[PDB]
Structures are given as structure tokens and as C-alpha cells.
Amino acid sequence: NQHLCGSHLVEALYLVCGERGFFYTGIVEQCCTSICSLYQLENYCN
Amino acid sequence: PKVCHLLEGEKTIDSVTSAQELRGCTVINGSLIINIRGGNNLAAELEANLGLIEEISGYLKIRRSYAFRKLRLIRGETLEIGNYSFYALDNQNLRQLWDWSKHNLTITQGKLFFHYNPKLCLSEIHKMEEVSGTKGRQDIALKTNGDQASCENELLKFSYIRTSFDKILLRWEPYWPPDFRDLLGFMLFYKEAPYQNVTEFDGQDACGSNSWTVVDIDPPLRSNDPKSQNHPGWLMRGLKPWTQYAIFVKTLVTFSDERRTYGAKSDIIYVQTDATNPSVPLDPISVSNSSSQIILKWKPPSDPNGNITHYLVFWERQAEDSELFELDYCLKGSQILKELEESSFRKTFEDYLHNVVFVPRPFEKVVNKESLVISGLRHFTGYRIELQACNQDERCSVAAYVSARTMPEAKADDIVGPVTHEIFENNVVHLMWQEPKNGLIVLYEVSYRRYGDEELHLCVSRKHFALERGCRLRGLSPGNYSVRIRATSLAGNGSWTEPTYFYVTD
Amino acid sequence: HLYPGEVCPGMDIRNNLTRLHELENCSVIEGHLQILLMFKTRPEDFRDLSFPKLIMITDYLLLFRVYGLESLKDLFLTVIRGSRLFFNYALVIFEMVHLKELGLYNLMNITRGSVRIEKNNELCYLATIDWSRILDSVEDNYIVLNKDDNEECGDICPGTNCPATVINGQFVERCWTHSHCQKVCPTICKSHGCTAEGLCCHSECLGNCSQPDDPTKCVACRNFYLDGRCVETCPPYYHFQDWRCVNFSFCQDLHHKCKNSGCHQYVIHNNKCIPECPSGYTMNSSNLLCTPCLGPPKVCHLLEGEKTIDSVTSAQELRGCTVINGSLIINIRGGNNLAAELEANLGLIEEISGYLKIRRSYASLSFFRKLRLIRGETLEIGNYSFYALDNQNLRQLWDWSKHNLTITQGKLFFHYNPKLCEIHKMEEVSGTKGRQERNDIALKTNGDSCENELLKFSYIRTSFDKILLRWEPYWPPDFRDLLGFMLFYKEAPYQNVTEFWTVVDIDPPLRSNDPKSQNHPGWLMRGLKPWTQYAIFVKTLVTRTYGAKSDIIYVQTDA
């Protein structure tokens, strides 16, 4: 992995956030170009 | 060794006709300029016309060659302006200089030149420097060489090799670029290769005379479970039994703006189709050189479907037609780039969407022979002979049927035994002679002549011969008569019997 | 009233269905409607969810992973204005897992944008949607990767009870779902609308009307809305959001609310309540009017100092901008009217403080109608002010016979432009001559024949199988540059053949000092079919010497 990109990123983010949900008031260049730890993955999600 | 001296010290080859002049030359005195830009099937005639060359005197210059098997030594007593012995310029389509697992080149004097060769990967250039011996004598345009090419750097491995008489099933490890969207699919190149010396670039001309058939395969459904990663594969059909094929695959990948994702290629592999039944052996011709000897010859089946072992033969005695035993014969009478742009468009739309939405906080077995001789045959009898080709001792092909009639025996129809005659009171002469023990006698001819009179002929059929136990002449004039008898057979007429004399009383 | 419901702000709905009820009362959405990232949902959660109040969308509609939704015929709308787009598109449906049929039988027109319906593995009744009557331009539509595209849809239109239209030469019925068809108005009505009897509506209605020819009975106005009446323009009222007209009081309260608290201090100019005064006008505190300011435009500070223009929505942010304190990168990948929309959004830009950059813009640079100065304070890696790379279909930069441009500092860059001529002309115009290094402009990757000279054939003779074609010699200013001549000829059944062929290479003639004994280049090609016409022209080859070319002549062999 370490790229968790495309149609896989949404599934991964839902699997890591099946209960609390995401946020609304960057995903690609942070999570697709390079490695992408669980830290920013939850940072995105509430 | 045929040495050809070029005029004015240099010869330019810009066409097949120009290359025809150096046909059969092995040492060329002068220098060569090769700038072929178009033509149909250029590789084969260029090989036939210039391949025999072994030593070149001047400099070898590839230039604007948009569209060398025995060369090993380049002396370069003459060097190009700037003292280069190799000048490779403006080679758009050049992908392989030589096959370097086999080919050797030697350079004596001069330098090298590699500028504007988009599909000449640099590895080939350094390997040229190694084999030539020019290392340290330099010339190589790093930006304009190998820049527009698929410089793959990953090796693929197959897993599930299967076989069939008309199928090969293949599977291989799935591969993914760092960003999995870039992978567009897999191509498989397969061709019929009698031997194991086939290069990937054989039979690749710009005009579409491709020798490696292309199969495009989509990526497999990428599963999150590593234990459920399906092996991409492809089954090919309509293949020829026991024919050596060459198979390898190469991956297609988009071009990242930041880091080059080269992809992967698979080493060329060789597969053998499973052997099956062969076809009917061609040209069965059966002849007879004797009354008891028949020779059969045949041609091998067109498709051996494997290594032939032996032929299965059966011959049968055929009875004569029943109608012959009853008849009385005495009676008278661009797409790639458009798809790349489309894929990039889909990828960039998805990227923009993601950035916007997310916000952080009897039988015989002939072996090794194509002819047979069979004895133990009755004289002048037809034989029905069959022939089945077998490539394994069982699996034999359908039989091939041929008929051969044995030669007749010369003295078999001859009437053996003297002719006996009986005289009755009514001037009727009864003639009796012994029937021969070729095939079936059809009739007999009885010729009797009175002394001083013309010959008289009578036909005695086998019906008459059996019924009367010979023949009966009636109404003869008194006198002395000489009679001769001849037997008629299927093969031909027999020999006339010795004359017999009988007298009719007045 | 024309719209019995209220007006409502642009909303975003995620992670639950409690917030969707906020659409209960608002009939027109001033903004964009997003229903995205709904995972836990089931079809039983949408059985009784209806919004018949919503009629018109101003910006766009984005659907993204609403699990359990099968059809929108029970959830919803006649016009989607599309003032602000979502990556060129006014209707985006992406990864709608369970959507079977669109069901938007109430939709009639999209004034701006396109439609994307992608990665929907259960969607049906696509081919029964006639996109022509909905959008003025349809080639931008991008509908692939659907169950309809796999030919697994059993598209059964109601009835023949639904209207049928001819698409790609095929007469196919149009229907949204198994119970609703596509309302096709008579061609005379245009976009005004037609009644259940098909009677054309009033000229200010848009889409549909309860009554024919009456400005207070439509379902959606065409130009602007006022007091339940559709009017071409609004009389002390001011235009707002291009769709409705509000009085001075309304714009006043909007301005006050945001000074009492991203938000534009709204102004009034040319009798429209617009969010900021245009270029060259100033902000009058007394009456919120735009008065003509003396001397120094609309300054638009780009975030981070660099912005990429990848689609129309990105270009919309720069509307009305004059000085761009930043750098631009153009990464367009395809679309229709791209010159038109890019020119409309960016025709007012005059200065770029940083560097101008063009990368992989597959789909001329004329849309920069007034770009005149590039200060080049910020340069690309390698101290570059203008950078042009992998522009597949780039042909022209600007019409230098009329356009002027100056580069203060920096070098240029042009690699991999297969159809781009003009570079030396730009170097001359912008004062950049003498600055580019080696390999700064690639020699053969650019333009891989902008001949400006015309060749003339000298002698022509024909036979049933052989023809000799003879033309006037050419000599460049440096005769050593002349490499040869390329002769082109093919079969030409008609005289409509263009230069974009069998090519023959011909060496330059031997150079003689006697003009009378001058040798002219020519060739005799054989194997020609008798009584057959061919299109023929010759091109010069040189090592700027632009070379010479010949017009397309037509020559017929003898019978």
C-alpha cells in the first residue's frame, strides 16, 4: 500500500471511520504521492 | 572472402537497391552511410544483402534512419569529422542496436556518437562502450537518448503453466505501479518459434508485418486481502500441436510528471503443445512386381502432431465379382496516446473530486520406413491395403486405403492335357479337354479346319463347357479335320493346344 | 407565486440523513447541493423522502456514494443554472453504488456546463435520455463505466407512449424510468417550454409553465425573476446572482451583515448588486456605487503564490481579474469551447507578476486577450519565465501582427510541441533575444514545417503510366542549409484533398554559376494508373530558413 489511492482511499477511510464520520468546514498529494500513515487519515475524519 | 572496394572512399545506402551492391561482400574497403527511411520488410533483405560483411574500413553512420549480423571489427583508419568511428544520429525508431547476449563488436580507432535516439535506452549504449573497448575514449546525449522509450526495469514471472493440443493456459504474478491507477493493462506477444534463438525484435517492421501476435489484457480486480490477490492470466486457443511457441508479456503504464514509473517485462519462455493424433499419410501408391509380391509406398502425413513412431498396415484378399461366374461372353456384343489522455483525464477528475470533498481540520508395423513389401499372395488377385500412421506405440491416424492386383502367371491359363474326341453315327464330334486348375476362365475358343478348307471358329462358354463337359460339333462335312483349343481368362487368352486330327466318315 | 417556496443557501450534507430535511421548504437553491459520503443508508431510509418543492439549482448538483438510493424520481427540479461549475460539469454522479435509474423527469434544461455520470454499476435508462434537448453543447458529456455501457440494461420505456428522437442516426424512445418519459416540446418553443397540450410558453419562461404565455405561471424564469414575474431585466431594483433581482435594501442588508461580522462587501454597478466593483472603479462608502477611479484594475492575490488552471471552475475564480500577483500553470486536458470559456474568464488579465507555465495542455494561446506584461519576479526551476512543455495540439501563441507582449526578465522554454511553429517571433517581440541557452529551445521536438514561400512547377508532362513533374529551383540564404526536396503525390478522386501521401526524396540540383544553364530539380514517377487524377505538391528541406512549399496540383494520366 502506502499509496491508498483512487477507489481504495474512500473504502479505507470508511473502514477506519465506520462510526464517527468525516468533516466539512489535500488528500491526493498527502496520501497518494507519498506514504500515508493512520495519523492524517484520522485527522481528515472528525 | 569477397572484399568490395567502395567508390570515392564512401558509399551511402539509402535504399534496398543501394544495399544490393554490397551483396556477398565480407570485407568492405571505404566507409558506409546508412539512411534508410522507408520500405517494406527492410530487415530481411538488409540481412541478406549486408549481413555477410565482417570488417568495414571507414566509419559506420546511422543517420535519419526512421524506418548487421556478421560485423565484428571496425578498423577506422578513416575517422569522421571530429574523429568518430560510430555516428548514431536522429534514430527515431531505433530500439535495439544488436542482440548483446550473442553479438560481439570490436573497434580499433575513433569515437562514438549517440545524439537524438529517443528509443535507444542508455544501457545499450554503455554496453556498446564495454564491448567495443572505447571506455575512456570519449558523445552520448543523455537527454535525447532513451528519453522516449519504455525502459522497463522489472522482471515478471509466470506461475501456472498448462498445456493442451490447442491451448496453453498461463498465469503470472500481478504487478502494480506505485500509483495503481497508472496500470492500463498487459500485452502478451506470442509467435511460433521452431528454435530457441528468437529475439524480441525479429519481425517488427513499421509497416505492420509484425511476427509477435498481440493480446491485450485488462488489470484484475485489486482485492484488499493479500491472500485473495487473483493471478492475472489468459488462455489462448487455436494453437498447433507439438509446435514450439515463444511467449512473453510486457506491461503498459502511464507517465508520471514527477518520477518515472518504468513498468515490467517478462523473460521469453518456450512452451510445447500436447501431442495428438496425426493425419492420414499422404500419397499411398501400391504396385505389384510379382504374382506374389506387392510393394506399398507412402508419404508422411502433413501434420506430424508429434514424433512419428510406426505405421499400421492390413492387407486383405478380395474375391472376384460374382457376376463374372454367370455371364456368357460368347454372345455378340495515435490510439495509444488518445487512450493515455483519456485515462489521465479520468484520473485527474477523480483526484480533483477527492481534494474538494475531503477537508481536514494379417498386419504389419513398419518402423522407420515409408515403404513395405508383402509376400504370401495368390497370383493375380486384388488386395485391399490400409495404412495408419502412429506417432506413439496406442494412437494411430485414420487408415488410408489402396488396392493392388498381383501379376498373373503366364502358364496358369494354359490348357494342360491332350484333346480327346468321340465320333457318333450322326457325324457329331464330341471334344473333351481338361480345364486348367489365372482366376476364372470365362470361355474357350475351338478352331477346326478341314484339309484344304478355311478355318472355322467356335466359342465355348464356361456354361457350355460345364454343361457339355467340352463341346459337340454337329453337321460337319465328311473329311479330315484338325482342331486346336485355346483358353480365355480374365488376364488374357491362353496358349493354343496341340492339333488333334479326327476323320468324319462319308 | 412563481416560486411558492423560500430561498436557501448552498448546503453540504454528509454522514447522516437528519440534515436532508433542511430542503423541506426551499424551492430554489442559491448555491450548490451536495449529497455525498452516505454509507450507512438503506433503501428503507428513502422510501418516503420527497422534495417536490425544489425547482431550480443555481450552481450544480454532486452525488457521491449515497448508499441505498435507487432512483431520484421520488427524491426530487427543472433547471440547473450552472453559474459556478464543478470541474466543467453541472451534474456529477460519481460512485452511486445502487442508483438504478435517474428519474429526473422534471428536469428540462442546463444553461451552463456538462453532465458526468461515472462508475455507476447499476444505473439504467441512460440511452433513453436525449441530452441534446437539455444542453446546448453535448460533446462534453462524459458517461462511461456504467451497467448501461455493459449492455446489461433492460431499458423498457413506458408504453409507444414516450416521445422518440434520432440519436447517432437511430430512432430511439426517450424515457427516464419505466413510468415516466422525456417531455419533448415542439421545436418552436425552444427553451421556453410547452404545456401538457404542448403550447409554447411565454418568452421569459424556462422549461415548463402552468399556463401558456404568461410571465407569472412558468416554473422557472429564463433571464431574471421578480415578484413572481419573469422579466428580461428588472427596472430601482438591481440584478443579483444572474437569476433574481433585489432592491437596494436587500444588498444593503447583505453588506451590513458582513461588515458586522470570505464574504464580499457587495457593491452596485450598472444596476446590478455584484460582489466587487469591476476593474478601474472604486468603492464609494456613501451609496455603495462604483465610481470611476483615476489611474490604478482588479488585483487578485493567488494563494501560496501559485495556482493551477485545470478546469473551468478554476478559471472562474479569476473572473474580472487584471493583475495576477502570482504564477499560472495551465493543465487543461480536454473539452469543448475551451478557447471560448477560458477567454471569457481570463480575457481581462493583463499582468502576471510571476512566470507563465504550460504543461500537458492537450486541447492556441489567444485566449489571453490582453496579457501584455510578465514581470517574472518568480521563475521556474532554471530561471525560466515562460515554460511550454508537452503541448500536443498547440499551434499558435499569439497573432503578433496585432498582439504585443514584453518579458521583463527570464528565459524561455519549449520542448515536445509536435505542432507548434512563432517561437523566434516571440523572442523578437518580447525582448528575450540573446537570453536562451543551448537546449532551451529543442530543435526538432518543436513542430515535428512552417513554410512561408511558394514553389512553382516549371514543366509538366503526362502519360498513361508515367508523369514527369518539374518545378523552380530553391536556394536558401545559406545554400549549405538546403537538404533536398520532398515530392508528395497520391490518388485524388476529387480536388478536396489536403496536405494532412506517397513521399519521394529528391536531391538539390547541382549548383551552376550560369543562370541560363541553371539546373532545375525534378522527378519522373511511374506505375501510375491511366486516366487517373492525383494530388501533387513538393516541399523543400533545409537545416530561420523556413524553406519553401508548393500548392496542391491535380494531374490526370492519359486514357
UniProtKB/Swiss-Prot annotation, chain A:
What GO molecular function annotation could you give as one example from this UniProt entry? hormone activity
- Quick one: a GO cellular component term? extracellular space
Q: Report the record's disulfide bonds.
A: 5-32, 17-45, 31-36
Domain of life assignment: Eukaryota
Which Pfam families does the entry link to?
Answer: Insulin
Q: Name one GO biological process term.
A: glucose metabolic process
Keywords, comma-separated and alphabetical: Carbohydrate metabolism, Disulfide bond, Glucose metabolism, Hormone, Secreted
Zinc as UniProt keyword: no
Localisation: Secreted
Extract the InterPro entries matched here: Insulin (IPR004825), Insulin-like (IPR016179), Insulin-like_sf (IPR036438), Insulin_CS (IPR022353), Insulin_family (IPR022352)
Residue ranges annotated as coiled coil are none
Q: Does the keyword Cytoplasm apply?
A: no
PROSITE patterns (UniProt xref): INSULIN (PS00262)
Quaternary structure, per UniProt, is:
Heterodimer of a B chain and an A chain linked by two disulfide bonds.
Provide the family line.
Belongs to the insulin family.
Q: What does this protein do?
A: Insulin decreases blood glucose concentration. It increases cell permeability to monosaccharides, amino acids and fatty acids. It accelerates glycolysis, the pentose phosphate cycle, and glycogen synthesis in liver.
Q: Tell me the protein's name.
A: Insulin
UniProtKB/Swiss-Prot annotation, chain B:
Describe the processing and modification events after translation.
Answer: After being transported from the endoplasmic reticulum to the Golgi apparatus, the single glycosylated precursor is further glycosylated and then cleaved, followed by its transport to the plasma membrane. Autophosphorylated on tyrosine residues in response to insulin. Dephosphorylated by PTPRF and PTPN1. Dephosphorylated by PTPN2; down-regulates insulin-induced signaling.
Write out the ranges of the annotated region (Insulin-binding). Answer: 350-358
- What are the glycosylated positions? 29, 83, 104, 197, 289, 307, 480, 493
What happens on changing residue 383 to C? In LEPRCH; abolishes post-translational processing
Q: Which residues carry this modification: Phosphoserine?
A: 65
Task: Indicate the impact reported for residue 397 to I.
Answer: In RMS; impairs post-translational processing
Distribution of this protein across tissues and organs? Isoform Long and isoform Short are predominantly expressed in tissue targets of insulin metabolic effects: liver, adipose tissue and skeletal muscle but are also expressed in the peripheral nerve, kidney, pulmonary alveoli, pancreatic acini, placenta vascular endothelium, fibroblasts, monocytes, granulocytes, erythrocytes and skin. Isoform Short is preferentially expressed in fetal cells such as fetal fibroblasts, muscle, liver and kidney.
Q: What is the effect of changing residue 396 to A?
A: Does not affect S-nitrosylation
**What mutagenesis or variant effect is reported for residue 143 to E?**
In LEPRCH; ARK-1
Record comment regarding domains: The tetrameric insulin receptor binds insulin via non-identical regions from two alpha chains, primarily via the C-terminal region of the first INSR alpha chain. Residues from the leucine-rich N-terminus of the other INSR alpha chain also contribute to this insulin binding site. A secondary insulin-binding site is formed by residues at the junction of fibronectin type-III domain 1 and 2.
| Function, in words | Receptor tyrosine kinase which mediates the pleiotropic actions of insulin. Binding of insulin leads to phosphorylation of several intracellular substrates, including, insulin receptor substrates (IRS1, 2, 3, 4), SHC, GAB1, CBL and other signaling intermediates. Each of these phosphorylated proteins serve as docking proteins for other signaling proteins that contain Src-homology-2 domains (SH2 domain) that specifically recognize different phosphotyrosine residues, including the p85 regulatory subunit of PI3K and SHP2.
Query: What's the protein called, per UniProt?
Result: Insulin receptor
Q: Which residues of the full protein are shown?
A: 336 to 946 of 1382
